[PDB]
Ligand SMILES: Nc1ncnc2c1ncn2[C@H]1C[C@H](O)[C@@H](COP(=O)(O)OP(=O)(O)OP(=O)(O)O)O1
Ligand SMILES: Nc1ncnc2c1ncn2[C@H]1C[C@H](O)[C@@H](COP(=O)(O)OP(=O)(O)OP(=O)(O)O)O1
């Protein structure tokens with residue numbers, strides 16, 4: 057098919073308002089936008105959770121076919137999970153003037169003690185665009201997993217790719233960044249092992 | 254150092270949840286203490302958490318025709334970081350008190366895209382961004398006859414599975430729910446088509 061129809065020019069962001077400002081923000085967008093039928097929308101307002109944007113790193117060891125995961129508590133998981141301690145990808149906020157790659161390498165070093173070799177982009181996704189602006193940009197990074205060493209109270213895990221992917225299937229890994237990265241790895245590891253060796 | 258293939262909820266003390274903002278959505282300050290990997294308990298920690306409820310997601314897959322049904326609508330929170338705020342997405346809706354994932358998914362497929370659903374199977378249930386929001390989304394794949402789709406301003410698209418996945422690879426589909434669902438389909442479609450035929 058022919059994909060989406062409209063672009064930014066087809067929407068008028070009339071104004072924004074910050075309804076809550078703390079560590080994060082809750083903003084109200086007021087806007088009008090074009091309709092598929094032709095006309096123009098009424099004035100629309102939407103609450104948006106604003107927390108900046110993140111870089112994510114999947115540490116992959118192509119010699120060993122192993123991944124490095126970081127475990128730490130995420131209290132927001134409490135209400136819908138058996139435990140709020142989650143197995144996750146390395147990640148951090150992108151500050152002004154920083155690149156996805158700069159941040160991913162830095163966080164790999166200070167959350168997992170990992171020196172990263174080559175990187176490659178995986179995917180950049182919107183976490184939940186009905187209610188938050190957050191975008192997370194994922195890279196895969198070449199590591200030697202035998203060197204992983206842990207520490208914000210963080211435990212470092214080394215597991216085989218196949219076990220990590222089985223834990224996605226089983227629900228033991230169930231946060232978006234880690235699901236997306238590990239599904240991508242399951243689709244791309246043959247070529248990635250070919251390339252990095 | 255690391256762990257090579259822990260805590261439960263008795264190891265966390267939620268002291269308070271302090272309302273920060275109440276509107277359409279909510280922002281709460283969680284105040285809590287938790288067990289530390291090296292022994293003892295943390296001091297009191299506070300985290301701002303976006304509370305917006307939880308969602309059911311349906312990937313409508315026609316296994317006879319190897320086609321997927323996508324829905325297009327504007328999501329203004331995509332504006333700042335995306336080429337366009339109109340997104341191609343899976344069918345989805347909030348789960349209200351007492352409702353099941355399957356009931357919500359089937360209802361939204363009918364109202365959002367005109368589809369009756371035959372068999373379903375679970376894909377995965379994931380936390381969208383658990384550092385800052387409690388939101389969980391539970392994805393099903395639903396058997397549909399893609400030649401019955403039709404159709405808040407929404408436009409329905411019927412595309413080959415291979416095209417929908419190519420759009421994930423190219424960044425033209427880049428919201429978490431649709432990426433996770435279509436990566437899962439690319440890993441499972443051969444067995445799924447055989448099971449449903
Ligand atoms: N991120 C969001 N996604 C979806 N709905 C949202 C979001 N933030 C706020 N809302 C709700 C709050 C309001 O009920 C509704 C606003 O819709 P809109 O078309 O702008 O005005 P309205 O006059 O229909 O609304 P109201 O129901 O408050 O009278 O959207
Ligand atoms: N959801 C969140 N994720 C990550 N950091 C968060 C989140 N919400 C708030 N923060 C940040 C903001 C503050 O730096 C800190 C929250 O307050 P808190 O844990 O009490 O530390 P603090 O810097 O205010 O010091 P003190 O312990 O002396 O009160 O964490």
Ligand SMILES: [Mg+2]
Pocket residue numbers: 147148149163
């Ligand atoms: Mg960090």
